[PDB]
C-alpha cells in the first residue's frame, strides 16, 4: 500500500462512514462506486457501512442485499457486520433469518454466542416471546450458556404470560449449564402453578 | 538469589532431601513371583472391577452413574448396531472409554481372546 492509496482510502472512508451514520444507504452506495471509479477495492469495512446504513433505517431487504454484494465481491463480512444483521432480524421478528445468519457466522468460524444473545433479547423486546423461546432453546440445547440476566429475563417473561412449559424448560437448561435456580426463579414458576387448580 | 559467575551462566542451589526418610528403603521394592496371579486377574475380569471402583470415586451418586452409563450405552447401539452383542459389549465399551477419558489406557471393551486355541471348533473347557 502506497502513501497515495492510504490518503485516498481515508477520505473515501471518511465520506462513506459519515453517510452510514447519517442513515443514508443511497449515499453509501455512491461512495462505493466512487471507490470503484478510482480503482480502490471495497473491503469488509466498506460493505459494513452499507449494511449499517440500511439496518439503521429498518430496512431488512436492502441490508440483506448489501450482504450479498459483500459476499459477491469476495469480501469476508466482519463479525460486527453479522451482528448488525442479526439484531435487525430480531427487531422485525424474523427469527428464521436471524437463525440463518447465526449459521453463517458459524460457517465463517466466528463466535455466535454473543450474536445469539442479542437475537433473543431483540425478540423479547419486540413482543415476539414465542419466537424468542424457540431461538433461546435451540441455543441452550445446542450447548451455549446464556447470561444470568437473560436467564432471569426469559423465565420471568414466560411466567407473566402463563407459559409454564417454556419457563420450566429454560430453568432446567439453566441448571444444566451450571447456574442453579434461586428463590426468584421458583417464585416465577409458582405464580403459574398456583392457578392450575391442583395444589 | 540470582547469581552469575564469569561466563553469564546462572548458578543456583539445587534442592535436595538433606534428611532421612526411612520410608524410601522399604517401600520402593517389588515381589517377583506374581506372573501367574496377574494373568488370572485379567482372565477373570478383575481389572474392570477396579476400574468401576475408580470411576465411582469421581461420582457423587452411584445411581446417577449407573443411569449415565446406560444412557451412553444406548447411544452406542443406535449408532453402530452390528458391532455389539458378541465379543464387544456396549456396557463394557462405555466403561473402558471412561477410563481412557481419565488419561489411563485400557483395551477396548476389555475384550481378550485365548491365543492357544487349537483352531476352529475347539471350545476351552472350564475346570470347576
Amino acid at each position: 500500500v502506497s502513501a497515495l492509496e492510504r490518503s485516498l482510502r481515508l477520505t473515501f472512508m471518511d465520506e462513506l462512514m459519515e453517510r452510514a451514520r447519517n442513515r443514508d444507504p443511497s449515499g453509501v452506495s455512491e461512495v462505493i462506486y466512487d471507490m470503484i471509479a478510482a480503482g480502490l477495492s471495497p473491503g469488509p469495512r466498506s460493505f459494513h457501512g452499507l449494511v449499517v446504513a440500511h439496518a439503521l433505517n429498518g430496512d431488512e431487504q436492502g441490508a440483506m442485499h448489501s450482504l450479498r454484494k459483500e459476499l459477491g465481491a469476495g469480501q469476508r463480512p466482519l463479525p460486527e457486520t453479522m451482528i448488525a444483521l442479526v439484531r435487525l432480524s430480531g427487531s422485525k421478528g424474523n427469527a428464521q433469518r436471524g437463525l440463518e445468519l447465526l449459521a453463517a457466522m458459524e460457517k465463517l468460524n466466528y463466535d455466535i454466542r454473543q450474536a445469539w444473545l442479542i437475537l433473543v433479547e431483540e425478540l423479547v423486546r419486540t413482543n415476539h416471546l414465542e419466537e424468542a423461546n424457540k431461538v433461546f432453546l435451540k441455543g441452550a440445547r445446542g450447548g451455549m450458556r446464556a447470561t444470568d440476566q437473560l436467564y432471569d429475563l426469559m423465565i420471568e417473561e414466560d411466567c407473566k404470560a402463563g407459559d409454564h412449559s417454556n419457563a420450566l424448560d429454560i430453568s432446567y437448561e439453566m441448571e444444566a449449564a451450571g447456574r442453579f435456580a434461586t428463590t426468584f426463579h421458583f417464585n416465577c414458576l409458582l405464580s403459574v402453578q398456583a392457578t392450575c387448580g391442583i395444589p | 538469589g540470582i547469581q552469575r559467575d564469569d561466563n553469564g551462566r546462572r548458578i543456583w542451589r539445587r534442592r535436595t532431601l538433606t534428611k532421612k526418610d526411612d520410608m524410601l528403603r522399604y517401600k520402593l521394592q517389588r515381589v517377583p513371583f506374581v506372573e501367574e496371579q496377574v494373568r488370572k486377574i485379567k482372565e477373570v475380569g478383575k481389572v474392570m472391577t477396579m476400574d468401576i471402583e475408580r470411576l465411582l470415586l469421581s461420582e457423587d451418586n452411584r445411581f446417577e452413574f449407573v443411569n449415565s452409563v446406560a444412557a451412553e450405552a444406548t447411544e452406542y447401539v443406535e449408532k453402530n448396531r452390528d458391532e455389539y452383542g458378541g465379543t464387544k459389549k456396549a456396557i463394557f465399551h462405555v466403561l473402558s472409554n471412561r477410563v481412557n477419558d481419565l488419561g489411563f489406557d485400557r483395551p477396548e471393551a476389555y475384550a481378550e481372546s485365548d491365543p492357544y486355541k487349537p483352531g476352529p471348533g475347539y471350545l476351552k473347557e472350564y475346570y470347576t
Binding site: 450479498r68 459477491g72 469476495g74 440463518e100 | 445411581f63
Partner: peptide, 17 residues
Amino acid sequence: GTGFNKGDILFYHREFC
C-alpha cells in the same frame, strides 16, 4: 435407586471470478 428423580446463505453467493 436408579428410578429416583425420574432416573443457507454463503452458498450461491461466491465471487464470480
